[PDB]
Structure formats: structure tokens, C-alpha cells
């Protein structure tokens, strides 16, 4: 008679109501961590680890989910870090409210393919309207655009101070790693900034190290820990005793030739260490291993040798100091040449005190003048929060300098799109106009969440918010009310042009493209079959 599957089958409006409650179970979590009045959470594990964070990606990655519609919204937050980097609480609330308003349409016996086709006409029109209603590029504002866009990202986190201490350190970090490319591409690789953590003084003592901050120790306590006018030798091979390979064995037939082979394992080893040290090299960085026999040659000659450094840290030092990453001997059948003209340069390599640990600093690197940020917090829970908040702040200034276009934040984009799409649904709307009209109400949840978390008036402040944006579209008298946002500290609509509340363009363009595409896949689960777990057979 029925289906003889050994799992479970649920059809109809059961799964159509379960996917909305699965998406609302995720959105109601992250609704309390949006905007400058948002608050952080606690993520306690079974082993006892506590993670205090408010970013939309760190919470949903550590949180376990079971529903298939819940894994779509959790993987939607992971894509926002790679594509944009701060846009990762706002996408989850929009994509869940896109399913909440579309559930009210399919309960009115409206076909979901008209809602899918109605959402594509509203998503492509939202990108078209936001690209024709921008204020200015990065020429008029200058450095004031980079600082004000950085403070908007920090307002939802622990580094949202009233001053410009953390804002100036981010702009000075991205501007110091300007790496040009072919065909006129000024790239800004923000992954080259080594963000370090140390439980020390307050947040106002966060050092901006112009150069690189290596997270390693010297090793042997007989080397000079401060070298002025240093020459960095970046190399990746273990400075240990000469061990033969698997194909080579030592089969001796004469007992007199025994001790000459035993001394040869250290003579070939020390032959490399004397030709890399006679060329003026004082700092040697190694990703392999330097044993206790080879540490004597640096104490005797007065050189610094750092062992077991990361491979991702050696590439950031050799590119910034002009050093060449050498793995072995080379240069056309040469015995030991080392190409001594390709040594790195540094002004000062100094191991400072980082509150009961050792940290090596390189000052200005003499070639590229890179930057590294050492964070200072109260405990380890604040340092993990300060690292995530700084990494999201580095991604904001990266997209502004690459794509010179900013949009007003604080719900100013979602207020203008809530009224333009209602007029867009009336012109060319015959049967898909109800999906475009619900696309505007789903976008209004971003200024609605700012009024809930601020404990302000909800149905009056957003009603006063769209009152200025309606007069900016139907009354062409140059009212300039396209930048009207929210003042959550006062509870009144303010102008985000003069207040300095700036967000990048692709933090909302890619947010509206990812949330609309995720809402289509969850809208097509009218039939769902769940099989039994095959564990013990």
C-alpha cells in the first residue's frame, strides 16, 4: 500500500512549517547580538571551555544543529567570512525572515515558484538601486571614510570605545601592507597581519608593531636577545646532525675508518652553519629544528637563532624584509654558496617582555614596512573576543580600499529599499507582486532589531525612519534624506552622512544575494524523507 521505506516520511505543510521554525530557532539566537546595542553570548562546551563571542560566524559554527534547514543558515554564516568578513549576523536574520514571510504566502495557496521568481525580481532590483544611490567614493572623505567605517564594525563588539584608538590602528595596518599586482590592482592582504594575544594591561596598551611580531622564543639562553642592524636569514631545513636516508647505509669493513664517519656527521652539519654565518647574518629563522650541538655556533659568534617557526610566518617575514626562502643548496652545481646578496634586512630584532612569555619583534623590516598588532586584554576570554573583532575590522577597510564605495549603515539601506520595492511591485506586478511586497517587509527586520536591543520605541522609531525615506523618493526637491538612520543612544532618526556611520557596499550587496539564494533552497522542501541512522547494522 504505502511506501515501504524504513525511515520516516512527512509531506504537506508539516515540513513547510518546520523549516521556518528551524530558521527562526537560529535567528532568535543571534537577534540579541546585532548593532551597537547588541550583547555578547557565552559558548560553554562539555569539556569546560568557555567562548565569549558575539560574531554570527563563531556562534553558529560551534553550535550543534540537527535539522537540514538549520545547516543551510549555519553554512551561510561561514561563507560571509571568506567573501566579505563582517556581514555575518545580518545575513542570518534576513534569510530567516525571507522564509517567514514566504510561509505566509504559501499558506494563502500561492505557488512557491512565484515567490522564488518574485524574490529574484526584488533581489536584482535591490542591487540596482544601491549602486545608483551611493553618496561618494573615497576621494572626498579621504581618511575620514576609513576611520568611520572601522568604528561601525567595532560598535557591536568589545572594542567599541568612544575614542579612535582601535580605529586608527586598523587603518594604519591596512595602509602599510599595500601590495600592488598586475593590471593596476592595489591588493590589501589582511591575512598577513599577525594578530597576537597576551593577558596583560588594558585595551589602551595595544601595541601597533610596525614590522612583524614573531610568536617564538630564542631557545638557548646564551644568545643576544637584541640585535641592532640585523640581517635576517630565512631558511627551511632542520639544523640537526647529518642523518643518512633509507637508501644509504654505513657498512664498514675496516675498524680504522669507524671514527672518521662518526665525526663526518657533525663536520658536514657545521660546514653549512659556518657559510651562512660568515656573510654577516645575525638572525636565523628555521621552520625545521636546530639541535643542541648547532646552538653553540650562534652563542660563540653572537648571533640569534630562532627554531621551529611557522611556515605561514616565514613567508610574511621574507616578503617584508627582502629575504629569500632557501630550502637547500643551489646555484648551478655549487658546493656551498648560499647567495649571500639575498639576505634580509631589519632595523632591530628585540625580544621584549609580554607578561611572562617571550615574543620576538622586528622593527620596520627595511624593505616593505609591514605591520603586526599585539592585543592586550584582561583574560583569555577577552583576547579571543578582541582577535575576532579585530579580524572583522580588518575586512571592512579592505573592501573600502579595494571597492571605493560605501553605503550608510544603521538601517538606512533597508529603509530605502523597503519603499522603492513597494513602488517597484506596483508597476510590473501581476501575480508576483506579493513576493516583492513581502521582500520589503523582510528587509525591515534589520532596523526593527536595532530598536528591540536598544529597548527603545519599536513601531514608532521605524515608522519615523521610513517617513524620511518616503519623502526622499516621492518629493524630488533635493531633500537628501537617503542617509537617514537610527540613533540608538537617543532614539531618534539621525543623518548617517555627518554622524560617520559608514558600511561597505558589498557588506549589503553580498548579504542580499546570499540570503535570497539561501531562501530559495529552503522554500523547496515540500516533501522530506528522513532515513533511520545506520550505525550498528
Amino acid at each position: 500500500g504505502p511506501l515501504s521505506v524504513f525511515g520516516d516520511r512527512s509531506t504537506g505543510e508539516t515540513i513547510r512549517s518546520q523549516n521556518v521554525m528551524a530558521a527562526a530557532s537560529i535567528a532568535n539566537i543571534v537577534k540579541s547580538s546585532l548593532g551597537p546595542v547588541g550583547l555578547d553570548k557565552m559558548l560553554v562546551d562539555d569539556i569546560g571551555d568557555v567562548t565569549i563571542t558575539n560574531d554570527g560566524a563563531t556562534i553558529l559554527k560551534l553550535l550543534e544543529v540537527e535539522h537540514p534547514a538549520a545547516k543551510v543558515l549555519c553554512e551561510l554564516a561561514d561563507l560571509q567570512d571568506k567573501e566579505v568578513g563582517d556581514g555575518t549576523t545580518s545575513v542570518v536574520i534576513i534569510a530567516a525572515e525571507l522564509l517567514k514571510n514566504a510561509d505566509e504566502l504559501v499558506k494563502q495557496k500561492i505557488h512557491p515558484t512565484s515567490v522564488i521568481s518574485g524574490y529574484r525580481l526584488a533581489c536584482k532590483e535591490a542591487v540596482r538601486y544601491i549602486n545608483e544611490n551611493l553618496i561618494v567614493n573615497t576621494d572626498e572623505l579621504g581618511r575620514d571614510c576609513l576611520i568611520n567605517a572601522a568604528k561601525t564594525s567595532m560598535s557591536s563588539k568589545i572594542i567599541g570605545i568612544n575614542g579612535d584608538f582601535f580605529a586608527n590602528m586598523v587603518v594604519d595596518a591596512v595602509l602599510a601592507i599595500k601590495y600592488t599586482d598586475i593590471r593596476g590592482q592595489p591588493r590589501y592582504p589582511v591575512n598577513s597581519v599577525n594578530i597576537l594575544k597576551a593577558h596583560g594591561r588594558s585595551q589602551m596598551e595595544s601595541m601597533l608593531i610596525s614590522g612583524y611580531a614573531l610568536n617564538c622564543v630564542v631557545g638557548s639562553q646564551g644568545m643576544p636577545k637584541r640585535i641592532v642592524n640585523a640581517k635576517i636569514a630565512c631558511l627551511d631545513f632542520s639544523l640537526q646532525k647529518t642523518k643518512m636516508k633509507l637508501g644509504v647505509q654505513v657498512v664498514i669493513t675496516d675498524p680504522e675508518k669507524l671514527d672518521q664517519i662518526r665525526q663526518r656527521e657533525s663536520d658536514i652539519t657545521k660546514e653549512r652553519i659556518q657559510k651562512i654565518l660568515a656573510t654577516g647574518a645575525n638572525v636565523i629563522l628555521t621552520t625545521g629544528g636546530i639541535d643542541d650541538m648547532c646552538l653553540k655556533y650562534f652563542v660563540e659568534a653572537g648571533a640569534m637563532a630562532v627554531r621551529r617557526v611557522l611556515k605561514r610566518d616565514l613567508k610574511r617575514i621574507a616578503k617584508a624584509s627582502g629575504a629569500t626562502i632557501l630550502s637547500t643548496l643551489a646555484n648551478l652545481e655549487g658546493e656551498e654558496t648560499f647567495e649571500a646578496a639575498m639576505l634580509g634586512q631589519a632595523e632591530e630584532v628585540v625580544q621584549e617582555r609580554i607578561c611572562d612569555d617571550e615574543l620576538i619583534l622586528i622593527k620596520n623590516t627595511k624593505a616593505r614596512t609591514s605591520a603586526s598588532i599585539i592585543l592586550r586584554g584582561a583574560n583569555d576570554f577577552m583576547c579571543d573576543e578582541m582577535e575576532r573583532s579585530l579580524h572583522d575590522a580588518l575586512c571592512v577597510v579592505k573592501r573600502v580600499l579595494e571597492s571605493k564605495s560605501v553605503v550608510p549603515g544603521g538601517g538606512a539601506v533597508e529603509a530605502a529599499l523597503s519603499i522603492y520595492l513597494e513602488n517597484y511591485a506596483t508597476s510590473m506586478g501581476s501575480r508576483e507582486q506579493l513576493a516583492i511586497a513581502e521582500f520589503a517587509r523582510s528587509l525591515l527586520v534589520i532596523p526593527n532589531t536595532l530598536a528591540v536591543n536598544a529597548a527603545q520605541d519599536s513601531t514608532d522609531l521605524v515608522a519615523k525612519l521610513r517617513a524620511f525615506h518616503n519623502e526622499a523618493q516621492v518629493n524630488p526637491e533635493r531633500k537628501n534624506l537617503k542617509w537617514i538612520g537610527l540613533d540608538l543612544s537617543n532614539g531618534k532618526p539621525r543623518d548617517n552622512k555627518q554622524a560617520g556611520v559608514f558600511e561597505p557596499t558589498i557588506v549589503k550587496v553580498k548579504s542580499l544575494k546570499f540570503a535570497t539564494e539561501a531562501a530559495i533552497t529552503i522554500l523547496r522542501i515540500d516533501d522530506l524523507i528522513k532515513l533511520h541512522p545506520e550505525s550498528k547494522d
Binding site: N28, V44, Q108, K109, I110, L434, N448, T449, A451, V452, D457, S458, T459, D460
Partner: protein
């Protein structure tokens, strides 16, 4: 991990707080509204609920379905009590009260998640309800030519729509004619105990009938009932409350005798006590005897020899209907029997309807009661037919004392959305998002008339909002044709107090769900 005291809070109780509590109450009312959602409209199906004992009850009434779900949710019990009060006040407002009260919470469900302290929602719900129950009274039509054939036609149209959405398809013209004729035979009290609805298994719905008199089920008799033939052209009924047995003992009598000459005189006196009571029933014309107390083998054979009929162990609910049918009086003592206490009928026979025997009375013109015998093919089929009969009786019971009727279907629920949206555009403040949300919540009654049979319900609401804003105010949803139609001209009528008590009970239930902010449950459940 937070609460770890030495002395706990109360015992172990959990309590939600704030905005997650209120959405938990609104979404709970949406689940219990699905059990009355598919039972609306003439194209609405019924539901079958089986309990733990295995008893099946198939019905579509809101007062029958919601009482068998065994709902233990605190907020969802509010929608069950308004379905019970609608059956107690009106009788046919049941599925519409539960579903409309759930829409009052779902239309404010995006509003309660974003601010909007609920004292503004309670004030807006009470304001829109008082304007809704006043526009019904100002538009409900009435007549000034009653006590004629036109008033009986008004009672028949309200009973056909009350018999709609039931298990009756083509028997609307047959059953609803009997419902109007049932309440017109009653007195000026309209008591529901003055009409017997008895279910006889076997026969179609066309085999049912409305007896002008009464009829009982012919309960357990004794030897002598195959005699006493059932042909009476003008009998008299003796309603009694006495025992006609030889063993009538007062349970405290000790008859101490001394000799054998007086011992036989006691046994002869015990037969003379019973035979003197039978001589009082005799010599008075009372050929039919009815008593709620049992009759032994002695008085059964005495009436068979004197060509008299009797019936013992009659239920007390049937003797009260028998007293108002024949116009007599129940006499406990047989010494005061006369012509003023006996009944009078014309046709009294014992038929064989459905296999079981039934002693029916007919022919009495001064009949203040009636009996509607139901014939069906199943026990659950006749229980639904009895439940559908009570909804048509309680509609026509209230229609006599208040003949103000309105249009059926979604005609009133759509035009109340017109008068409330026009009122919401004339007041400032936050009430434009609440009075207008109250008007959009009333549009689900024409939605469930269409969603149960397709009908393209999105396009049919654009025709309803355009017709009510242009011309008449009684345009609703046609069931046979997939179009809008004037329900007042199509004789789809319902009394005005059906929708007045529906809007009043749904608003007071919706104001109670939004007013509770904490729910504390004690774990002691024994």
C-alpha cells in the same frame, strides 16, 4: 549552571519570561486551530478522534473535536473554552470562534516580537470589537410582518445554513423543515428537554421522521407482552409512579402472626393490596399504562385479560415528554385517578422500526412537545446526525426571540473589514497597525470557504474587497460556482447574534493570551 542555591525557588518549577513566552502562546494556538481549520464551509471535511479505550467519535463540530484532543497547554485551553461557550450560548459558533481567535494572535505575532507592550493591543482589540458588534446590529435585516408564512420561511433558511457543513448533502430540504416544525410545537420556554432525539440503527436519512407525540424504546418487559394488542383508536394514558409488583415492601415491616387462620389472611391481603391498585387503573378508560417503576408478572397478566396495555421501567426523561404530549399528569397514588389526570391520543401502536420495537403516540392536537426519530447506518453516523440536529435546533431556537438575521458565508466578515480599514485611516498613532490588522484577520472566514476546495482564494478576495467597496454589503463566496455571489439573494442566512457572540468570545480570548507574561507550572502531578 547559574541557579545553585542551598534552598531552591519553590520546588523544581520552570517558568518562561517575556517575549519568548508570548510567541510560545501564539504558536500554540496555531496548532490547535488546525483541528477546526478543515471543518469550515460546506466543502469542509470531518475528523475522527479515537481515545485510549478505542471509542471512535467522528464529527466536525468545534465543541466536539476540541474536547477530545486532551490539550494540556495553558494558553491553548482558552480556545477550547470559547468553543464550549459558543455551543452554550449560540450552538453553531464553534469552528469559527476558535479559528478567528487564532488569527487575532497571528496578525499581531510579528508585532509582539518587536516591542509593542500588550496594553496597546488590548485597548485596540476592545475598540475594534465594539465597533464590529455595532455595525452588525445596524445592518441586520428584520421584518415587521411576523406570525405569517414569511416568518416560517425565515426560520427555514437559517436552519439550512446551520445544517450546512454537516453530514447532510441533499437532505437539507427534508431535515430543516422538521427543525422549524419542532420548535413551533413547543411552548414559550424553548426547553431542549422537551424534544426527544432517539437513534434507531438501520435505515437511510430519508426514513427519519418527526413524531408529533412521543416514543420510547420498549424496555425490558415480562411474560404477557406478546398479548395486549397495539390497536387503539382513542386510548387513555395512565402515567404512574407506583410499583405494580407483589413484592412491594417498605423494608421495615415485620408481620408477626400467631395462628394459621390469620397467617392465610396476610397472604390474601398482599394480593388484595395489589389487586386494589389494578382496580383503580381499571374502570376509568385508561387502556395504556405507563410507570417508571417496574411491573411484575401479576399486573402484566391482569391487563392482558382485561385487554389493557402497560409499559414499565419507563425513563423519567420520557415520562416528562409523555406528560406534555397527551396533556395529563403523572399520579404517584392511584387513589386520585380521574378523567382530568389521564391522557388522550388517537394512534398508539408498537411498530418494528429498525428491528427493535417502539411504542409511538400520535394524533394529539394539544402537543407541547415532539420526538425526532433518527435512522442511520452506524452508531457514529447517528451521533453525528444528532450533533448536527442540535446545531440546527439551537439556531432556530434563538431566531424566534431575535429575528434579526445577517448574510451567511464570508459576507459579513468581509464588510466588517471594510468598515474597520476605513476607521483605521482616520485615527493617528500605533492603532493603524492594530485596527487594520484586526480587519485583515476577519478575512479568513472567506478564505476557509475557498481553501477547502481550491477556488483560487487569492483572486477571490480581490473581488470581495472590490464588491463591498462599490455596491452591496452582502456579497460572499458561492460554493457551487467559483465566483462571488450575493448571499442575501441566495438565501444563505444566519442570525445576527451568531456573529456577535463569535466576535465577542474571540476578542476576549485573544486579549487573555496577550495579557499573560509568565507561566509557572508546579511539578507535583499525582
Amino acid at each position: 549552571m547559574m541557579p545553585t542555591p542551598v534552598i531552591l525557588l519553590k520546588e523544581g518549577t520552570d517558568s518562561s519570561q517575556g517575549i519568548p513566552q508570548l510567541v510560545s502562546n501564539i504558536s500554540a494556538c496555531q496548532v490547535i486551530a488546525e483541528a477546526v481549520r478543515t471543518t469550515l464551509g460546506p466543502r469542509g471535511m470531518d475528523k475522527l478522534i479515537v481515545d485510549g479505550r478505542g471509542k471512535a467519535t467522528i464529527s466536525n463540530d468545534g465543541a466536539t473535536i476540541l474536547k477530545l484532543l486532551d490539550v494540556v497547554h495553558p494558553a491553548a485551553k482558552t480556545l477550547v473554552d470559547i468553543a464550549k461557550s459558543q455551543d452554550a450560548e449560540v450552538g453553531d459558533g464553534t469552528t469559527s470562534v476558535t479559528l478567528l481567535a487564532a488569527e487575532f494572535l497571528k496578525q499581531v505575532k510579528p508585532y509582539v516580537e518587536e516591542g509593542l507592550h500588550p496594553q496597546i493591543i488590548i485597548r485596540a482589540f476592545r475598540t475594534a470589537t465594539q465597533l464590529a458588534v455595532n455595525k452588525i446590529k445596524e445592518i441586520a435585516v428584520t421584518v415587521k410582518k411576523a406570525d405569517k408564512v414569511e416568518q416560517r420561511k425565515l426560520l427555514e433558511k437559517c436552519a439550512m445554513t446551520a445544517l450546512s457543513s454537516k453530514l447532510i448533502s441533499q437532505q437539507k430540504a427534508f431535515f430543516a423543515k422538521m427543525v422549524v416544525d419542532a420548535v413551533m410545537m413547543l411552548d414559550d420556554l424553548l426547553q431542549l428537554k422537551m424534544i426527544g432525539i432517539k437513534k434507531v440503527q438501520g435505515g437511510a436519512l430519508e426514513d427519519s421522521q418527526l413524531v408529533a407525540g412521543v416514543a420510547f424504546k420498549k424496555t425490558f418487559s415480562y411474560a404477557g407482552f406478546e398479548m395486549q394488542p397495539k390497536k387503539y383508536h382513542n386510548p387513555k394514558i395512565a402515567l404512574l409512579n407506583v410499583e405494580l409488583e407483589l413484592k412491594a415492601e417498605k423494608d421495615n415491616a415485620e408481620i408477626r402472626v400467631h395462628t394459621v387462620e390469620d397467617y392465610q389472611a396476610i397472604v390474601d391481603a398482599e394480593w388484595n393490596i395489589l389487586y386494589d391498585k389494578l382496580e383503580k387503573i381499571h374502570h376509568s378508560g385508561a387502556k395504556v399504562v405507563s410507570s417508571k417503576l417496574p411491573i411484575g408478572d401479576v399486573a402484566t397478566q391482569y391487563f392482558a385479560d382485561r385487554d389493557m396495555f402497560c409499559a414499565g421501567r419507563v425513563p423519567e426523561e420520557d415520562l416528562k415528554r409523555t406528560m406534555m404530549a397527551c396533556g395529563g399528569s403523572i399520579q404517584t397514588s392511584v387513589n386520585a385517578l380521574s378523567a382530568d389526570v389521564l391522557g388522550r391520543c388517537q394512534v398508539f401502536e408498537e411498530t418494528q422500526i429498525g428491528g427493535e420495537r417502539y411504542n409511538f403516540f400520535t394524533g394529539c392536537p394539544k402537543a407541547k412537545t415532539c420526538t425526532f426519530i433518527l435512522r442511520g447506518g452506524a452508531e457514529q453516523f447517528m451521533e453525528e446526525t444528532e450533533r448536527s440536529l442540535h446545531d440546527a435546533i439551537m439556531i432556530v431556537r434563538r431566531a424566534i426571540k431575535n429575528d434579526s438575521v445577517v448574510a451567511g458565508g464570508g459576507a459579513i466578515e468581509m464588510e466588517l473589514s471594510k468598515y474597520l480599514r476605513d476607521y483605521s485611516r482616520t485615527i493617528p498613532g500605533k492603532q493603524q497597525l492594530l485596527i487594520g490588522a484586526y480587519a485583515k484577520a476577519l478575512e479568513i472566514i472567506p478564505r476557509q470557504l475557498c481553501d477547502n476546495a481550491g477556488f483560487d482564494a487569492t483572486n477571490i478576495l480581490n473581488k470581495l474587497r472590490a464588491r463591498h467597496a462599490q455596491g452591496g454589503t452582502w456579497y460572499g463566496v458561492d460554493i457551487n460556482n467559483e465566483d462571488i455571489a450575493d448571499n442575501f439573494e441566495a438565501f444563505v442566512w444566519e442570525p445576527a447574534m451568531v456573529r456577535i457572540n463569535a466576535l465577542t468570545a474571540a476578542s476576549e480570548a485573544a486579549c487573555l493570551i496577550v495579557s499573560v507574561d509568565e507561566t509557572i507550572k508546579n511539578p507535583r502531578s499525582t
